[PDB]
């Protein structure tokens, strides 16, 4: 719909120039005709386009120089007139000869005292995922972005700020990160930066914020842009001493680094949902700096807290086993009751020194499950109730699993106060969740780590994108089972006595984990052999093997790239661990240099050999 | 905690050199500052730094000539002092000169006499993990090491000495096989065999062992220098004849085969952990020596020792068989007792002439026991008893095997001849790791040899790397599915009766070995199939084939080195049979030179095409 409407408009431009004689002879290089039109009478000069555009933009625009001129001498004015149009709001001609980086018709209108300071404001212009081009909003940062040495060198003799920002915060570095030629970003990087001396006005260029707070430095991380990064590190590392092949080299950690309450680099990386970010990793700073954090700090502390997470889970799994149960009071219903005991009532649960002994056994796994809550639940009040803390479900999916786990043991607490039957589904949920949550505190060996990437890329990529094909062929078959077996006695053979067991013998005949049906001692009906060798054929062998054979392909591509999906879950550990934990267990990592005569920031030695 | 001390005293370092006017201006380029200083009253010449060192020492560190020079016209007894500190004991400004290759700054030191037998003995130059360079102790061995052919040809001028050895025994031409760059290594080794000819001082310098007892020649071989071994076998070789594209080269098989009580080239490689030392195995007279012993001598005494080990274990397979049983002489306890036999007593067992036959067959697998353990167990007094024995363990598990099933056949004896109940247990670990030790003498076949070496390799690093993630889904489902079922009746659906038995079930049921359960005439309860559906999609579908698939590229990995972990068990094989076989019975290897004019040493001849 917004497409449409953006094509509608650049063939009603080539309307408009074909029907005006004055649009059409700046389109073509045709002086001859600009002379003429020129000397009549008003000549209709500051009509409009189709796109609010007048006869100098087009003449710019299809790189006329000398039907520009023409229009200059003629009409002096045309220069300091912007697009008034929608979609290319306060574009001038300025804007466009840079774009198109014609030299000699930058000077011609800045010899008329062009504006170097006019708002490309338009939405052909806004960062988007429908602009092919996100070039600025002020021609310096669209010579940037073009790759023009001679041109920026030429705006800001003229007088072009170089400070100045758009509607997203951003100055000219900026955007030559956002710029998809990365080496050449790099030398433009250079010369904005030689520019910037004069008397700084606040801090300086590369260490100005935009509206979300990204320096340079920061929107490079975050952005993925590894060659960026890699070019603006020299600015920030020194060289100590070099011992023939040794180099020992001393590195910031200002902005890499959790220096204060604002969000370091490493936890703009794993926030990101741009997963070429996490190529930043690889990079040396920050990749000793994730090594010296996990060896000191983080596994120490994170094997306290799963070896204290196994004697919760099994002081939890013996208050499950060893539950209040007494033999049932009435008397059975059918012949297919198979019950034989039942819960006991809440008086008559604690009775004894033994149900003593599971008290304190219980008063452990309602206190831990209100820890969790404690830690867990008053996140998602400081970050978005809804859409911001969901941001976090799809990163970590043991939020879910403990908040769920926590829940499940506050419903059989709630369930025995009032004594309230069937206790052993939210128990059920609760051990498998319990229990299942110890594949968690797997990232702290590197072995074991993304064995749990590969469960999840099987469940949420193979599985949740076969299983519609699975269950169109469950359900056919089941109710062609059902209606065959319908009019049969079910105590010979039951697989398919009602509609809900028809439904669980063909999921469980599909898998192979049940025997097919068969008597051999009664005659089963005709069409039973016809269906299962039907459904043995393209079930069994065929659709289970497609899915066997899909996963192995998710096991392959997960275990390719195992070294870098274990150290994304480490830093994703370390970043958890330390907002978490009071500061006077943490220590901050690296040499501060204080009392070394280097300031107040905090190094981090590396020392390597070429 | 030690590479946070050494980072502490690099920007230390650094402070003490921006603090001293002394130390500044040797850092710096500064003639000018050093006239003024040194031309004051006393100076402050020589004051330490944080590293111990002198203002002589930060000249020659940081490449500045024109520092040095001034500081050595001004304080000549600056030449002569090492670094007093405790991570750079010993090293002196002639070490630094001779590691930055600065030549001019050489040549002045040693017009003041500086010493060229120095000894660099601090920790920054130990051969360790942590140390980037191992270069040795002295400066013939540092100018060695960074491949500089003028200044070794300049310090041997000054005496330097050739066969000065370090801490570790090395001599100069032990630490070039232990640099990085092997190629450069090489010519570096022909250049300090040109001046190790004057009057032999005792066996020559390529002959000179270390604290270790290796020789360069078998250093380059522990430490899988392949490079290096190439360029050391051309000493060793002589080529007889040349006829056309024929060439017949006689090989030394000095230091290479079995010459006295010290180990041999081939057991030094087994024995080590570098698994880049395997690869000496295809070099050329080393691959054909091993064929030699192998086609010769070690597969007919190996196949002696597979086919006795087949009829010992077929003799104690029908010794447990006939073993001595009776009906039971109490009576039984419960519905759920099954058993109908038990063991004979001693006096019993031993009453026809059958049990006389049998018993010639249990004194066979009795002594056959005792012969095992004398072969075996006095390896473990000779080697460490703990930990150098350890080493055994690692490489050979056939020994842990052999030795466990010996002790369990003098286990069952002892319960034999006491009347112990229970032998069932002792024999039946008997028979599956009796039985499983004919695996072993699969190596004397190439095509079912690294069977095993794949066998090993999915426990140690596939099920002992991934069991735990199945343990923890395991302990959830089986403890899920306990209390589901505990309120039932356990004859009809019996998989879950107590807790044991419910994780011996669940076991089952994730390797799709028993059936699902299932009864279809009682109403089962209705979180079991919720359950048993969550169950059988991540235990059965995708954790059995996560390690199906894994377990499936450590098949693929074993079988594309298929020849050459083949020829790896070869060599173990044969090293083994000449330890414990007599010497009469295992001939010398290669033809001896005594009546062929050629010395006392045992060559081996080659004949190839080119
Ligand atoms: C990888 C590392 C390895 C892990 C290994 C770890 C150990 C793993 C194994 C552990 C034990 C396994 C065997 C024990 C079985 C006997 C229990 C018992 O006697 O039950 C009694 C009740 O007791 C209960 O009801 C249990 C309640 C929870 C116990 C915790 C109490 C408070 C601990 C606070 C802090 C907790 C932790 C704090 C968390 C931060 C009564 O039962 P019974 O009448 O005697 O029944 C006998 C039946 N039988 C005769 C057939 C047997
Ligand atoms: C990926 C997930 C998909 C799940 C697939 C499997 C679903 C599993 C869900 C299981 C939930 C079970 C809950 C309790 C069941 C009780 C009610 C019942 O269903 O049976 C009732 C029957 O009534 C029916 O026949 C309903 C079935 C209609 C067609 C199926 C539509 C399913 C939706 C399609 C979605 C399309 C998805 C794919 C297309 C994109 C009563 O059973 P009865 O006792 O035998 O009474 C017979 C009376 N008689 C004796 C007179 C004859
Ligand atoms: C790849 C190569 C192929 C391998 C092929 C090799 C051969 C493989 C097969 C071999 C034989 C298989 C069939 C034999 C079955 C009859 C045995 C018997 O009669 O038992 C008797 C007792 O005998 C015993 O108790 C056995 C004790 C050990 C025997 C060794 C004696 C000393 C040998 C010293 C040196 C040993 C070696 C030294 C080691 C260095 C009594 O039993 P029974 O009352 O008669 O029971 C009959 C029941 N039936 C009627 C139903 C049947
Ligand atoms: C890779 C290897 C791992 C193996 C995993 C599988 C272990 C296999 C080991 C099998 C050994 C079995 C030996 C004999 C069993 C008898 C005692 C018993 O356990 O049952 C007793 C129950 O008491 C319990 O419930 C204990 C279980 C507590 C939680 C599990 C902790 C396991 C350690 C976690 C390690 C974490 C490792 C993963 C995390 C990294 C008695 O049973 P009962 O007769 O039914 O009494 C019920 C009384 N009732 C009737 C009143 C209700
Ligand atoms: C699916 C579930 C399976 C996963 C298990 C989850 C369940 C249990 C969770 C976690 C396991 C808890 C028990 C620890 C056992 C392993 C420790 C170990 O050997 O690691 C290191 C020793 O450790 C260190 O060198 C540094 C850490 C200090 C010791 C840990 C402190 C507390 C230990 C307990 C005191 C508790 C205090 C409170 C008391 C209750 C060895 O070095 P590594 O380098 O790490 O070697 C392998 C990693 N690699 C591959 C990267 C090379
Ligand atoms: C009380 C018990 C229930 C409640 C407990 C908690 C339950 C919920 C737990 C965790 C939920 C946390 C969020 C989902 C986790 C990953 C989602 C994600 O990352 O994006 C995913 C899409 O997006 C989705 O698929 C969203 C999930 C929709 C279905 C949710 C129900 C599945 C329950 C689970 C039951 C499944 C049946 C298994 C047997 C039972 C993409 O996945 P990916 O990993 O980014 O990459 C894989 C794609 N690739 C292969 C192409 C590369
Ligand atoms: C999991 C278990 C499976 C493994 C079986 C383990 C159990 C039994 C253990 C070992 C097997 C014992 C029986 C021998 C059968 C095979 C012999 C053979 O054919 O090999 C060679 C013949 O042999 C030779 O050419 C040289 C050796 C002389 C003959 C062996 C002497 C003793 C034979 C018995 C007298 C005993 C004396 C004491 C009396 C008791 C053939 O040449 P090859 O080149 O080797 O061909 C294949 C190899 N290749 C792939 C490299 C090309
Ligand atoms: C009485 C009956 C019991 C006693 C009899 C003797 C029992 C013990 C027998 C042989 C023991 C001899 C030493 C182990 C052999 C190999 C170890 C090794 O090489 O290093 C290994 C690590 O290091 C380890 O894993 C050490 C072993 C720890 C577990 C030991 C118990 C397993 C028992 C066995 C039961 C398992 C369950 C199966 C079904 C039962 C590395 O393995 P790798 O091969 O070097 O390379 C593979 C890694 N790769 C794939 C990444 C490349
Ligand atoms: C009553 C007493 C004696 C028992 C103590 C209970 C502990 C076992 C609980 C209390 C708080 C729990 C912690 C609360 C929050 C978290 C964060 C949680 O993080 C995630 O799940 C990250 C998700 C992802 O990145 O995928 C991991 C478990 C952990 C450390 C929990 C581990 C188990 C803890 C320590
Ligand atoms: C009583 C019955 C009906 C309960 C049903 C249990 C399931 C709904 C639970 C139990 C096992 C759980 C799974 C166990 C482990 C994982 C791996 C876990 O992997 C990650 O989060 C990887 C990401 C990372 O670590 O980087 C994602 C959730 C998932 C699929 C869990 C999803 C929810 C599952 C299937
Ligand atoms: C495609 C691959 C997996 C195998 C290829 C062979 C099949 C197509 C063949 C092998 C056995 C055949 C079956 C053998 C016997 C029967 C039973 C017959 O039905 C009855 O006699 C019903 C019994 C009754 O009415 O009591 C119908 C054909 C059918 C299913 C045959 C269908 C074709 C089958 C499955
Ligand atoms: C009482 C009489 C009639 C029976 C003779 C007993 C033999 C069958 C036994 C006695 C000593 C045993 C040997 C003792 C030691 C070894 C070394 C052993 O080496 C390893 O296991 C290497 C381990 C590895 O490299 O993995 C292999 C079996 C072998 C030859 C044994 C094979 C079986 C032997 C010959
Ligand atoms: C009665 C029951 C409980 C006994 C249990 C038996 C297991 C503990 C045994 C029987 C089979 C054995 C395995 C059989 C064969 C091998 C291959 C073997 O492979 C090698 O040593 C290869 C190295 C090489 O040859 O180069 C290592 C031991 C292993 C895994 C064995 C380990 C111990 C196992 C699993
Ligand atoms: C993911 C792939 C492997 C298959 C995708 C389809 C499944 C998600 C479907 C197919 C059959 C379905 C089952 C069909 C019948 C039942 C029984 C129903 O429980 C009962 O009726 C219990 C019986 C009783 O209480 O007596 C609960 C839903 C469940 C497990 C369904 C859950 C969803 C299942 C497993």
């Known amino acids: 719909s917004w497409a449409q409407s953006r094509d509608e408009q650049n063939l009603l431009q080539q309307k408009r120039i074909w029907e005006s004689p004055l649009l059409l002879a700046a389109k073509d ?9 020129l000397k009549y009478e008003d000549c209709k000069v500051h009509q409009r386009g189709a796109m609010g555009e007048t006869a100098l933009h087009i003449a710019a625009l299809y790189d006329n120089l000398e039907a520009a001129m023409v229009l200059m001498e003629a009409a002096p004015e045309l220069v300091f007139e912007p697009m008034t149009s929608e979609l290319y709001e306060g574009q001038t001609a300025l804007h466009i000869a840079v774009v198109n980086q014609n030299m000699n018709l930058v000077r011609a209108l800045l010899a008329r005292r062009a504006s170097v300071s006019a708002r490309a404001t338009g939405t052909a212009f806004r960062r988007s995922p429908c602009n092919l081009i996100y070039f600025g909003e002020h021609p310096l940062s669209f010579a940037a972005c073009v790759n023009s040495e001679e041109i920026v060198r030429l705006l800001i003799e003229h007088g072009a700020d ?17 710029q998809p030629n990365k080496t050449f970003a790099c030398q433009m990087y250079n010369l904005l930066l030689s520019y910037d001396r004069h008397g700084d006005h606040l801090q300086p260029l590369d260490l100005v914020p935009n509206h979300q707070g990204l320096t340079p430095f920061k929107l490079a991380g975050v952005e993925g842009n590894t060659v960026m990064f890699q070019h603006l590190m020299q600015k920030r590392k020194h060289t100590q001493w070099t011992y023939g092949p040794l180099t020992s080299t001393l ?14 680099l490493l936890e703009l990386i794993i926030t990101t949902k741009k997963r070429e970010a996490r190529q930043i990793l690889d990079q040396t700073p920050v990749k000793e700096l994730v090594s010296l954090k996990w060896k000191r700090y983080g596994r120490p502390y994170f094997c306290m807290l799963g070896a204290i997470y196994l004697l919760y889970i099994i002081c939890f799994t013996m208050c499950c086993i060893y539950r209040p149960l007494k033999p049932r009071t009435n008397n059975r219903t059918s012949p297919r009751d198979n019950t034989l005991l039942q819960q006991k009532l809440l008086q008559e649960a604690y009775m004894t020194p033994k149900d003593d002994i599971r008290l304190v056994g219980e008063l452990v796994t309602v206190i831990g499950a209100i820890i969790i809550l404690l830690v867990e639940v008053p996140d998602i009040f400081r970050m978005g109730v809804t859409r911001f803390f969901g941001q976090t479900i799809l990163g970590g999916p043991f ?55 590969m469960i999840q890329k099987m469940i949420f990529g193979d599985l949740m994108r076969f299983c519609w094909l699975m269950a169109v062929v469950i359900l056919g078959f089941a109710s062609a089972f059902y209606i065959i077996f319908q009019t049969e006695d079910p105590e010979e053979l039951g697989h398919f006595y009602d509609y809900p067991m028809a439904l669980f ?53 997960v275990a390719h790239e195992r070294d870098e999906l274990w150290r994304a879950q480490i830093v994703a550990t370390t970043v958890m661990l330390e907002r978490k934990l009071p500061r006077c267990l943490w220590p901050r990592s690296g040499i501060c240099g204080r009392e070394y005569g280097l300031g107040d920031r905090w190094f981090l030695r590396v020392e390597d050999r070429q």
Not at 251 to 264: A, F, H, N, P, V
């Open 399 to 453: 939020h879910v699993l403990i908040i769920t786990y926590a829940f499940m043991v506050l419903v059989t607490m709630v369930m025995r106060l009032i004594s309230a039957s069937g206790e052993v589904v939210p128990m059920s949920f609760a051990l498998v969740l319990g229990w299942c949550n110890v594949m968690y505190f797997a990232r702290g060996f590197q072995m074991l780590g993304p064995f749990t990437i």
């Open 162 to 178: 170089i400070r100045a920002q758009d509607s997203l915060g951003n100055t000219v570095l900026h955007i030559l990160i956002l």
């Open 505 to 557: 013998s063909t999921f469980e005949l599909f898998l192979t984990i049940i025997d097919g049906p068969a008597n051999y001692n009664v005659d089963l009906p005709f069409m039973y052999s016809i269906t299962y060798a039907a459904f043995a054929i393209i079930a069994t062998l065929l659709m289970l093997n497609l899915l066997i054979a899909m996963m192995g392909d998710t096991h392959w591509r």
């Open 251 to 264: 590195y910031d950690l200002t902005e890499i680094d959790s220096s204060g309450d604002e969000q370091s």
């Open 29 to 37: 290089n045709d002086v001859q005709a600009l002379n003429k039109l």
